[PDB]
Design a protein around this nucleic acid. Structure first.
Ligand code: MG
Ligand code: MG
Lengths: 52, 141, 100, 34, 324
RNA sequence: AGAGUGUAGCUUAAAAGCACCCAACUUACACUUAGGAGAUUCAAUUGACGCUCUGA
RNA sequence: ACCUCGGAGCAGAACCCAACCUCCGAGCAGUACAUGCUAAGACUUCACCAGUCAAAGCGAACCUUUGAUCCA
């Protein structure tokens, strides 16, 4: 199944956004727009929010 | 002063006034149909069996500036009127005529294979080096 | 579903008004008529709504429509119903702001 | 790799075969119609 | 119920049972050409258009083409896609041959005919040439629809045309400031002897173009009329205003238009100079004002509307306090 | 001997558009892209050089 | 067995509807991580709740099936 995860910005900001990834799939690292920084920055998966 | 009697509302009757101000409307519909009508002037190329022809046509359908290799004045200077050389020559002639007619901006609507065509690439290059830009400015709302 | 035409021919329509809601492309967008993600037809300008029948030339990237049109006899032309908005007001006017 | 003279000869050969098979198809069609 | 068609239904003439024996559109472009032809063709149903609407010369041409083809260098260049074309020679030849027809198209598109002669057209037989001398070394030409600044058009232009009398006129079709239909004449030479222009009768002195700021782009027309026999004719706007329509009505018996060349003028500092120095008046400034945005009639209870609904109808953005 | 007479294959086209051929992509066809070849039968609307038909 | 939603029958021609009923599938999957932010004007399952579309603008790049409040 899929799990909702909290991608947390690697830019030092507290900005986090939620994505969906397969449980069997590896932890996610993804480029995403940082509104506070106003630039695309890397985000890393921190913790599993739920299992959907 | 009688010379300063100016009407409160000006009435510019030049058909190209708002188009050149980049304020006139473009027909923004027709999404399910090709080609799009969202232009003021369009570059249309007709490649027949023997002749290659180019038109600069307003949105209303009026043909504004044409260059046909059918015409003697141009066909008397090249070998074949149905090749890349003919396309480039007609493109340069049309670019000169567009500049003399004041049409600096245009829209070109090729099919994917027309765009991939080397002759059409040469025609676009000829137009852009002649001064005509094949991309109209956005409308100002 | 409550779909169908919301503005019949001759109806005055303001920019943004939904003209027709549809599941398929029963009516096609004409002049100054945009299409939503769900094929809803809305007015891009303020004016009068007109329904016409026009020759249908599908976008070349539309593979199914291109196949349909290539499987067609040499004299046939497809027709579709199009919805246009005939704009009423001009884009604007030039007004004397100052006599410098 | 290839040179310019051989390319020109290839183009001339293509043109001459164009003419030759054009005459061939023309005469075949003439026989058909006759 | 079914009302019968009011004419030939499309795709009815070819509607035959031999579909397999009927040649088909093997390609998209042939269908596109047919569809464009059909769209151009008139129809009995409502359509988008309803609402949004010598022998020796031939022999010489054939011989010249044969010579050009026979030239092996030309064939080699063409097959190598490297040949070029003399633009100046092509321009001159086109001007002589079919340039007047294209210039008539340009005039019709620019609305010169409908706005000057109320739709009455003609053909610019004489390949007229006008050019405003910029500085001393060069001179900006005035083609059919050119773009020339009033700074470059400050002084009167040099006119050349291979012909033999002539009346030359300049109008601003849309520069009028009071009456929409009228127009301003800028300079008018009459009874031109052949080609030389300095000997022309200067009835109205030369005026540079003066398009007001933010008033758009104005179209200025050089008219040239063939003249049979001279006729006596006749810095103030009331006397510079006139209508080419009735003006040429008063002279069409002996004058016939044979030349046109027109250009577009925008605002420039020379226009400030023109308005102040010699017109002696405050220059008008125009702004393109769009109509106010449409909002539906305000409701007492704007159900399901956002809070911005009230802002859509309030006029002043500053806080108000009523009686307090 | 007489009639119809006549633009490259077709054109109530006026030197054009469709047709036509190869080269590459196709098993192949097709598409597309590159190229190729083409005519108003001879003299002043008329007469005579060629084709079809009607006879021997 | 069903109870919500969606698609088809089931309504021949705006909408609405043959409830009950017949069949199918969804409590999603894939994709992207601007698949953002804002905002005229509209639609709407006949109330409300809810649910849709969207010009212009700003910013990046260059989408195809459900569940309120409270409470944690
Ligand atoms: Mg149902
Ligand atoms: Mg409702």
């Amino acid at each position: 199944k899929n799990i909702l995860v909290r991608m947390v910005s690697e830019a030092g900001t507290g900005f986090c956004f939620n994505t969906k990834r397969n449980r069997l799939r590896e932890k996610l690292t993804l480029l995403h727009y940082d509104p506070v920084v106003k630039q695309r920055v890397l985000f890393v998966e921190k913790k599993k929010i739920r299992s959907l | 002063v009688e010379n300063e009697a100016v009407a409160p509302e000006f009435t510019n009757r030049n058909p190209r006034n708002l188009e050149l101000l980049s304020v006139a409307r473009k027909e923004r519909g027709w999404r399910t149909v090709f080609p799009s009508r969202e232009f003021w002037h369009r570059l249309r190329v007709i490649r027949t069996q023997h002749h290659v022809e180019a038109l600069v046509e307003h949105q209303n359908g009026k043909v504004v500036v044409s260059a046909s290799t059918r015409e003697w004045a141009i066909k008397k200077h090249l070998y074949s009127t149905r090749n890349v050389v003919a396309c480039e020559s007609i493109g340069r002639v049309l670019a000169q005529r567009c500049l003399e007619a004041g049409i600096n901006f245009m829209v070109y609507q090729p099919t994917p294979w027309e765009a991939a065509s080397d002759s059409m690439k040469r025609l676009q290059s000829a137009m852009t080096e002649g001064g005509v830009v094949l991309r109209e400015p956005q409308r100002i709302y | 579903r409550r779909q169908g035409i919301k503005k019949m021919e001759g109806h005055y329509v303001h920019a943004g008004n939904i003209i027709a809601t549809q599941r398929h492309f029963r009516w096609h967008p004409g002049a100054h008529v945009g299409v939503g993600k769900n094929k809803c037809l809305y007015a891009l300008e303020e004016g009068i709504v007109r329904y016409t029948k026009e020759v249908y030339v599908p976008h070349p990237r539309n593979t199914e429509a291109v196949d349909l049109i290539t499987r067609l006899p040499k004299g046939a032309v497809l027709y579709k119903t199009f919805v246009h908005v005939v704009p009423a007001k001009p884009e604007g006017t030039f007004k004397l702001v100052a006599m410098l | 790799e290839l040179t310019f003279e051989e390319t020109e000869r290839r183009a001339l050969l293509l043109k001459k075969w164009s003419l030759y098979k054009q005459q061939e198809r023309k005469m075949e069609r003439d026989t058909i119609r006759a | 119920r079914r009302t019968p068609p009011l004419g030939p239904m499309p795709n009815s003439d070819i509607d035959l049972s031999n579909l397999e024996r009927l040649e088909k559109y093997r390609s998209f472009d042939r269908y596109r050409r047919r569809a464009e032809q059909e769209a151009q063709a008139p129809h009995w149903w409502r359509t988008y258009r309803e609402y949004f609407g010598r022998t020796q010369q031939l022999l010489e041409r054939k011989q010249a083409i044969q010579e050009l083809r026979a030239n092996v260098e030309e064939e080699r260049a063409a097959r190598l896609r490297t040949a070029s074309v003399p633009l100046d020679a092509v321009r001159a030849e086109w001007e002589r041959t079919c340039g007047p027809y294209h210039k008539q198209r340009l005039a019709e598109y620019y609305g010169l005919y409908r706005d000057l002669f109320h739709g009455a057209t003609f053909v610019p037989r004489v390949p007229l040439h006008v050019a405003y001398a910029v500085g001393e070394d060069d001179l900006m030409p005035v083609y059919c629809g050119n773009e020339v600044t009033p700074t470059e058009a400050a002084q009167a232009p040099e006119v050349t045309y291979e012909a033999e009398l002539w009346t030359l006129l300049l109008t601003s079709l849309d520069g009028h400031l009071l009456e929409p239909d009228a127009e301003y004449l800028h300079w008018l030479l009459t009874n031109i002897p052949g080609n030389r222009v300095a000997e022309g009768q200067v009835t109205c002195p030369y005026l540079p173009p003066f398009p007001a700021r933010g008033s758009g782009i104005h179209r200025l027309a050089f008219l040239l009329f063939k003249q049979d026999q001279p006729i006596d004719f006749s810095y103030q706007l009331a006397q510079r205003t006139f209508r080419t329509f009735d003006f040429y009505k008063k002279h069409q018996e002996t004058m016939t238009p044979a030349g046109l060349s027109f250009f577009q003028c925008r605002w420039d500092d020379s226009v400030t100079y023109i308005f102040h120095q010699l017109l002696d008046m405050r220059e008008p400034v125009f702004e393109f004002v769009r109509p106010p945005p449409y909002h539906p009639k305000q409701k007492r209870f704007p159900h399901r509307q956002p809070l911005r609904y009230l802002d859509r109808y309030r006029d002043s953005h500053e806080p108000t306090y009523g009686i307090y």
